[PDB]
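Sharing in case it's useful to others searching the archive later.

Someone asked me privately for the predicted structure of Interferon-inducible and double-stranded-dependent eIF-2kinase, so I'm posting the question and my answer publicly. Question first, with the sequence:
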Amino acid sequence: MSAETQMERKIIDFLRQNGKSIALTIAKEIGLDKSTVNRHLYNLQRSNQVFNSNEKPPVWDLME
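And my answer, the predicted structure tokens:
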């Protein structure tokens, strides 16, 4: 407990800043693989930090 889950949230936040979207974009944003993205979003998902959010295309973005 220090800043573990913070990593997940920071990478999507970068994405968030260019344009939150699906996991496929996140992968391009950070130059990582989509499976990598999946693990990160999965953490935040269950944590109710990240989920699909409010818009018409169910965004992988957050409310924070």
